[PDB]
Design a protein around this ligand. Structure first.
Ligand SMILES: [Mg+2]
Ligand SMILES: [Mg+2]
Ligand SMILES: [Mg+2]
Ligand SMILES: [Mg+2]
Ligand SMILES: [Mg+2]
Ligand SMILES: [Mg+2]
Ligand SMILES: [Mg+2]
Lengths: 115, 133, 59, 120, 39, 155
RNA sequence: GAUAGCUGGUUGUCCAAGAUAGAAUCUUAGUUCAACUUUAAAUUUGCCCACAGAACCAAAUCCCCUUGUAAAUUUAACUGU
RNA sequence: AGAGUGUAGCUUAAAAGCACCCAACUUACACUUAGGAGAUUCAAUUGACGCUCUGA
């Protein structure tokens, strides 16, 4: 027995727990993490921030909603521009975005005093 | 003779009060939806267009060479369109916009003259931040 | 918008205390106060006080 | 892996031959069923046991009535292999305030309101 | 998603034929890569 | 489990094996226009617009005027004048209502004042507050006028 | 009367609830946390839930109103697995 | 010579978008910067004139 005992070590990693934390229809508050995962899964949509680990987190109190909108990234990403140019005429990427439909308003004009 | 709580419906009130919430998202997507009065400039063949859309997509003020008016009398046409748009936005109430062109488009002389004319007309392109708290 | 002519009109040809507003924002969220925050900082108790001043029961 | 066994839509689709074989009909269908457990809850998954407990069928060979609605329909289908279903057809009017002490279930679903103890 | 009716809404790999050497068929009605030197 | 698509999926009518014989986007403005046109569509699955959603004579005269203006050359194109009073007069006399209706719709005038039923203004209008003999404060569609300047009836 | 992750045993009647994903440990014949289970109490939602929602390189699964129900969260205990 | 078509090369809104070209980056094609060009053959769908099938 040599060269085939257990030289292929290293595979002893636990689960990273990276998925969806607030499914669609849930009343998420401002600041809660919506999901965490590697590689841009759900691109940022309306009222959805992005941290450093390519994660998402709600910014306003509302219900989470997912749609399929066209993808038009920033010209900075030369790789994205190249991939787009490599597509034919009638071609669309259609990525998965995330939205947060706001419920409450930003404020209300209340009566202070009668002068 | 006053209600316990006031209720305003003017969509422009919150937009001008610097309190209307913007689309903080759309970070990886271009252009960014965080604004109140985006100034989109379209350049086509034989004509030029400059729009001032809204977050919902409603055009408020704009100017085109096909207006059977300014067509009378191509950086000159761009400057004229910019001046007309600035005057219309001033007489209409708009005074702040956000222009997010492309690098090859921002490094152009036409866009430079357009921005110069817009600034001379009396319109700032910065849009103050949204007051929180 | 607001101006001094508005107040002049109100106090001259209206005869009634004019109203005043401030546009108040909704209060903070602050979820249910947990008994054992465990991983929360010392500022956890600061989010549920009224208000900072030294309050003492009976002595 | 033994997952939650589902049922397609082609199964629950009564055909003219099925209607001719039995007595039921599509137009003006029954409104209540006669649930009667004929199989134990043991040797079956836990969700089936929970469904049986919710339906109230602890004592087997006992009659039970439930609403004939999509929700209850699926709840029944979930354990169809453990319960007997039959329609509750009332020959006469529903049990009035006066017909509540003298009643009877009778097999083949026939709730009689004038339950007596004499021969015809 | 797979089960949802919106499956394959962002399949773009097949739209790009990512990767000329000696490729001169000449069998059927075809002409291989040509060269024209502009002296 | 695999379900069929209700409507036609995108990029399905151009998924031919002859991808090299297609146009292939060589720029970014064309792709932006295509994306805008696609977003401006109903779509059968989802979209961002779900939760947050006599003439011949005039044409001949315009062509003649354009030809005359072009032949007048001006030489200052290589940086010109281009007045504004004539343009303003034309806008107020020609397509003034075209933009006035858009402004009213953006401000919510027809849906709030008339409770719907939009229309187009036929005859123009001009109003300006008089801050004495001069200067005069104009009241344009959406101008910011102070209550002090509005202390008297305008002209 | 040493210690000892170890062998052995640990006294009358009856009722009820009562089977565990894993991690660390000079550690896998032992210990802790977590999880299961028990007692008294304050709260309201616990499970199958229906349209829909949930990825480029097959049985399925998550949220899920009406609907069957009466179960669930927490507080204070502590042995047992 | 019987019949058909009739906004520039393409699109039905009948005066627009694509499409095209010279000058610069380009060894070269291109994305770009600055410039150029254009149609309704006429009568208050109606009849005649560029073009299409019939030893013509
Ligand atoms: Mg592995
Ligand atoms: Mg001892
Ligand atoms: Mg030991
Ligand atoms: Mg022993
Ligand atoms: Mg003893
Ligand atoms: Mg027991
Ligand atoms: Mg150690």
């Amino acid at each position: 027995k040599s060269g085939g005992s257990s030289k292929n070590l290293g595979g002893k990693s636990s689960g990273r727990r990276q998925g969806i934390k607030k499914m669609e229809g849930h009343y998420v508050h401002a600041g809660n993490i919506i999901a965490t995962q590697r590689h841009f899964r759900w691109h940022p949509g309306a009222h959805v921030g992005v941290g450093k680990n390519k994660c998402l987190y709600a910014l306003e109190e509302g219900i989470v909603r997912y749609t399929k909108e066209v993808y038009v990234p920033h010209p900075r990403n030369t790789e994205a521009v190249d991939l787009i140019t490599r597509l034919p005429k009638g071609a669309v990427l259609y990525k998965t975005f995330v939205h947060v439909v706001p419920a409450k308003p930003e404020g209300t004009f209340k009566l202070v005093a009668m002068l | 003779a006053v209600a316990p709580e006031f209720t305003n419906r003017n969509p422009r009130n919150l937009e001008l009060l610097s309190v209307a919430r913007k689309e903080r998202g759309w970070r990886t997507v271009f252009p960014s939806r965080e604004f109140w009065h985006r100034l989109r400039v379209i350049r086509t063949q034989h004509h030029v267009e400059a729009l001032v859309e809204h977050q919902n997509g409603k055009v408020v003020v704009s100017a085109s060479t096909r207006e059977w008016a300014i067509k009378k009398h191509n950086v000159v046409a761009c400057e004229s369109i910019g001046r007309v748009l600035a005057q219309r936005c001033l007489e209409a109430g708009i005074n702040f916009m956000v222009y997010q062109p492309t690098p090859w488009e921002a490094a152009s002389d036409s866009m430079k003259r357009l921005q110069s004319a817009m600034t001379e007309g009396g319109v700032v392109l910065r849009e103050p931040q949204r007051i929180y708290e | 918008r607001w101006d001094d002519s508005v107040t002049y009109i109100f106090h001259q040809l209206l005869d009634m205390r004019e109203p005043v507003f401030e546009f108040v924002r909704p209060p903070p969220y602050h979820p249910k106060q947990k008994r054992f925050p465990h991983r929360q900082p010392l500022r956890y108790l600061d989010r549920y006080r009224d208000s900072h001043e030294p309050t003492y029961g009976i002595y | 892996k033994f997952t939650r066994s589902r049922i397609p839509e082609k199964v629950f689709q009564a055909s003219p031959e099925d209607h001719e074989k039995y007595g039921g009909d599509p137009q003006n269908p029954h409104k209540l069923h006669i649930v009667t457990r004929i199989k134990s809850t043991r040797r079956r998954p836990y969700w089936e046991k929970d469904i049986i407990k919710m339906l109230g069928l602890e004592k087997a060979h006992t009659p039970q009535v439930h609403k004939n609605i999509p929700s209850v329909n699926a709840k029944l289908k979930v354990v169809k292999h453990l319960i007997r279903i039959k329609p509750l057809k009332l020959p006469q009017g529903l049990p009035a305030e006066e017909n509540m002490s003298n009643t009877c279930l009778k097999s083949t679903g026939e709730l009689v309101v004038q339950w007596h103890l004499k021969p015809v | 998603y797979k089960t949802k009716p919106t499956h394959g809404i962002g399949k773009y790999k097949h739209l790009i034929k990512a990767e000329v050497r000696a490729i001169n068929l000449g069998t059927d009605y075809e002409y291989g890569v040509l060269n024209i030197h502009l002296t | 489990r695999r379900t069929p698509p209700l409507g036609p999926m995108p990029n399905s009518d151009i998924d031919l094996s002859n991808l090299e014989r297609l146009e292939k986007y060589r720029s970014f403005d064309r792709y932006r226009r295509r994306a805008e046109q696609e977003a401006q569509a109903p779509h059968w699955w989802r979209t961002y617009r779900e939760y947050f959603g006599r003439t011949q004579q005039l044409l001949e005269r315009k062509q003649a005027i354009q030809e005359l203006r072009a032949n007048v050359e001006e030489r200052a194109a290589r940086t010109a004048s281009v007045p504004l009073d004539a343009v303003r007069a034309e806008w107020e006399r020609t397509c003034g209502p075209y933009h006035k209706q858009r402004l009213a719709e953006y401000y919510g005038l027809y849906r709030d004042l008339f409770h719907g039923a939009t229309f187009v203004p036929r005859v123009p209008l001009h109003v300006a507050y008089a801050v004495g003999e001069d200067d005069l404060m104009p009241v344009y569609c959406g101008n910011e006028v102070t209550p002090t300047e509005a202390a008297q009836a305008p002209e």
